[PDB]
């Protein structure tokens, strides 16, 4: 038992274990302690996988690295490739042509939308939606609810909802529940009415069918999804208008991309954002504002999506760091500064010469050290209760100037809001989205559903599991809007006569400096991603990744400070400590990617 970051940690209560944590990417174990009233007073994040990509990269060609690191994760597919090519280009002083920049941005924003929407419906929604309750719904009332929640969504008839309900009925009545088997259906932690549940199930199915269309943008520019191809110096998808399926990119291919973008915009505006606003409103009305964790104090992002390539002041998701809940002061974040981003392994299954210090990733070290503490319940190969006083995770502990930070869409939206309030005009759209969302959640949706109106500020609403879920949906919407603009810029540039897609001036290693270092950063779907590379005599000398879920899922540092996951579970009541509904709801709001976190 000790106090840190305003949290009173206490491990004297009842211990609860969740292993595996499901509906995430990869492998995680979570343990908590609850007090006499089932309130979480301690939380422990354990990354339960490691592959060692950083070790595997040593000695290889920097031009090949993107393909290796892309395979860190097939969910956030391509963001590691983007970070890698950016890192190599930074090391070798390579500037990519405008079309390559725009195509990479379109691919990045496509990933954002796909990842966010799939996460919400297929991984997160079952923490808010009781699918068995959907069976009790009235299709006419569901139709009426759909028309209130999103009047522009064309799939709203009672017959349509009846058909969906009937298929769910037959599925459940088969006795083979599949992914719904042994679920927590009927828990008092679920608060939605039947009609809301049926609506959400319907959209789960709609999203499952539609998500495969969105990724065809990756397929056009990158050959395949998952795992589209990238290139140091630009993009491989050469442009030729007149070329008629002779080149990778012609006007027909670009028209196809635009059609997919337009579909994305409709889905975000008509399905995803309204669903999250409605579900968020109903859980707000129930008083479920838990899960803020570090978002209430410390948030970080590198900043992304510059209007003008290589001009960071024009970032459309402007970054930096906020500390102590002070939204009037955004500190600049520099990935090159050895005193800023550092990783500790004090409570991680790795070894440093000196574990009292954090290493900046250009000086990073990845030597495994799987060893369990003295208070462990069980054995080395059969853990009953993990010992969080010692090493307890395959995830390293990243900190910024020693501070524990939350990363992700919520962090980016808090930063955008802070920037917009300080006069940054590039952040105007996220600010508009937040103010609109607050008015919907507080006033418009309650008035439409006959519920009392509330007066929560963004300061109050945002640092919460609801807020974290909302920010993801808003970011998806914003990314669709931005790539629509990027498409127009791309086509205009090509039509103006610039068809260049790759800078090959430094492709050959005989042109390289004999030593170099570089860093590439990305606003990945789950937060701040960085790759740091050292090159020597044409080969990778060091390659270190610090990934968003590494930040959020980190175990404690040398000072004992907790990371975002652990902080987010604190002070949360559980309806039943043997049903991890609230734990899953909050953990899932970070969209944990464990393969990413450990690499």
């Amino acid at each position: 038992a000790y106090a840190t970051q305003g949290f009173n940690l206490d491990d004297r209560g009842r211990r609860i274990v969740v292993d595996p944590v499901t509906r995430i990417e990869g492998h995680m174990r979570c343990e908590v302690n609850v007090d006499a009233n089932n309130v979480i007073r301690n939380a422990v994040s354990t990354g339960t996988m490691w592959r060692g990509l950083e070790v595997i990269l040593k000695g290889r060609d920097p031009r090949d690295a993107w393909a290796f690191v892309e395979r860190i994760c097939g969910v956030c597919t391509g963001c590691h490739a983007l970070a890698s090519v950016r890192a190599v280009e930074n090391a070798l002083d390579i500037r990519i042509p405008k079309n390559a920049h725009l195509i990479r941005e379109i691919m990045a924003k496509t990933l954002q939308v796909h990842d966010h929407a799939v996460h919400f419906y297929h991984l997160h929604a079952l923490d808010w939606v009781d699918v068995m309750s959907a069976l009790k719904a009235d299709p006419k009332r569901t139709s009426e609810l759909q028309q209130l929640v999103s009047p522009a969504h064309p799939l709203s008839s009672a017959g349509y909802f009846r058909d969906i309900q009937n298929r769910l009925k037959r599925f459940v009545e088969s006795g083979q529940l599949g992914p719904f088997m042994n679920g927590y259906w009927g828990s008092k932690a679920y608060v939605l009415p039947p009609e809301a549940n049926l609506m959400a199930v319907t959209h789960y199915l709609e999203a499952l069918d539609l998500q495969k269309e969105w990724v065809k943008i990756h397929t056009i520019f990158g050959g395949k999804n998952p795992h589209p191809n990238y290139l140091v110096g630009g993009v491989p998808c050469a442009i030729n208008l007149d070329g008629a399926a002779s080149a990778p990119v012609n006007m027909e291919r670009l028209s196809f991309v635009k059609a997919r973008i337009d579909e994305i915009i409709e889905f975000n505006k008509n399905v995803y954002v309204p669903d999250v606003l409605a579900i968020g409103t109903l859980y707000k009305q129930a008083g479920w504002l838990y899960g803020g964790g570090l978002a209430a104090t410390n948030v970080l992002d590198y900043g992304e999506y510059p209007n003008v390539a290589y001009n960071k002041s024009t970032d459309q998701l402007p970054g930096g760091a906020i500390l102590n809940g002070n939204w009037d002061e955004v500190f600049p974040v520099d990935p090159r500064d050895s005193q800023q981003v550092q990783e500790f392994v004090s409570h991680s299954w790795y070894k440093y010469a000196d574990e009292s210090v954090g290493l900046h990733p250009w000086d990073g070290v990845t030597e495994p050290n799987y060893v369990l503490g003295a208070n462990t319940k069980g054995t080395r190969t059969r853990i009953e209760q993990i010992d969080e006083s010692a090493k307890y995770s395959w995830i390293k502990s990243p900190r910024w100037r020693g501070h524990a930070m939350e990363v992700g869409p919520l962090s980016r939206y808090i930063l955008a809001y802070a920037h917009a309030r300080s006069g940054n005009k590039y952040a105007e759209r996220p600010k508009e989205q937040l103010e609109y969302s607050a008015q919907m959640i507080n006033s418009a949706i309650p008035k439409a559903l006959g519920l009392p109106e509330t007066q929560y500020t963004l300061k109050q609403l945002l640092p919460s599991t609801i807020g974290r879920t909302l920010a993801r949906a808003l970011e998806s919407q914003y990314c669709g809007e931005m790539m629509h603009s990027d498409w127009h810029d791309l086509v205009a540039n090509i039509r103006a006569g610039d068809t260049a897609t790759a800078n090959v001036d430094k492709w050959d290693p005989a042109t390289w400096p004999l030593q170099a270092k570089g860093v590439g950063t990305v606003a990945a779907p789950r937060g701040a991603l960085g790759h740091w590379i050292r090159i020597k005599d044409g080969r990778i000398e060091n390659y270190q990744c610090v990934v968003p879920t590494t930040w959020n899922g980190s175990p404690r540092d040398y000072k004992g400070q907790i990371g975002a996951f652990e902080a987010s579970l604190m002070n949360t009541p559980m309806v039943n400590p043997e049903q991890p509904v609230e734990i899953l709801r909050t953990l899932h709001s970070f969209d944990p990617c464990l393969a990413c976190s450990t690499h």
Binding site: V18, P20, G178, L208, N225, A238, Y370, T381, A500, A595
Partner: protein, 264 residues
């Protein structure tokens, strides 16, 4: 009743699961609701922890020798197997337990089939493909990083329709999807045959879709359906979009030299 599938995840990146849900014919929705009973799958399942674990026991008992085990990823043998921990125990223990009573085993992707990226030198976890650990059960390899969506659902469809594993080549891959090298039907082949090659990225030859052999294309030594079936409902494939095949369906493709070094 629908055939139960227990879908396990070892060390992986989850690309095979993502590819599976891209399937257009059949739709993944229709596979899950009408074809199989996806009874265990960390990615999508409602239950967690003890409730998830309890499902494995129930299905193995009720459908003994009549469920399909699908494996994505692979088991590590280093770190006493605890570089991949599930329910506080090594993944390899779960893999062996569930494999015992399976009707058939599907090794999804290059991870399960051969090792993939984590098994590339120096393989710090001693990641090991499924067939080197489970040696007494029928296994079908569906390699690729990830495999094509319709190849994955094509395998499921065949197994469900016929209650048989399809005919396999010597390496355990289904001949219905892996009988051709990319280079056999690649649309850039007439350029290859005429000695017409890209030599530098975005050169005039690249803008005319010339052959990618000299840029490192591994299509001539790689068996997959990419040049015909193609990706994401036949939208493109790596070569059509301008990058050479990197050999991703072939055993040990990460350690066959630079992706940009041409075949000799």
């Amino acid at each position: 009743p629908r055939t139960p599938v227990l879908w396990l995840h070892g060390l992986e990146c989850t690309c095979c699961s993502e590819s599976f849900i891209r399937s257009a014919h059949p739709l993944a929705k229709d596979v899950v609701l009408s074809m199989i009973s996806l009874d265990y799958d960390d990615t999508l399942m409602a239950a967690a922890g003890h409730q998830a674990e309890a499902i494995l026991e129930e299905i193995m008992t009720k459908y003994k020798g009549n469920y399909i085990l699908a494996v994505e990823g692979n088991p590590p043998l280093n770190q006493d197997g605890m570089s991949c921990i599930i329910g506080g125990r090594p993944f390899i223990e779960q893999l062996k337990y569930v494999a015992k009573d399976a009707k058939a085993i599907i090794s999804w992707g290059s991870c399960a089939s051969w090792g993939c990226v984590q098994a590339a030198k120096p393989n710090p976890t001693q990641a090991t493909p499924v067939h080197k650990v489970i040696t007494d059960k029928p296994i079908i390899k569906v390699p690729g990083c990830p495999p094509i969506a319709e190849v994955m659902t094509g395998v499921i469809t065949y197994m469900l329709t016929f209650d048989r594993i399809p005919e396999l080549d010597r390496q355990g891959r289904p001949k219905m999807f892996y009988s051709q090298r990319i280079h056999d039907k690649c649309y850039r082949r007439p350029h290859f045959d005429a000695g017409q090659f890209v030599e530098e990225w975005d050169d005039e030859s690249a803008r005319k879709g010339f052959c990618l052999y000299k840029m490192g294309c591994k299509g001539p030594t790689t068996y997959n359906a990419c040049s015909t079936t193609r990706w994401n409902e036949g939208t493109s494939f790596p070569i059509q979009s301008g990058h050479g095949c990197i050999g991703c369906s072939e055993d040990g493709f990460w350690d066959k030299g630079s992706f940009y070094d041409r075949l000799t």
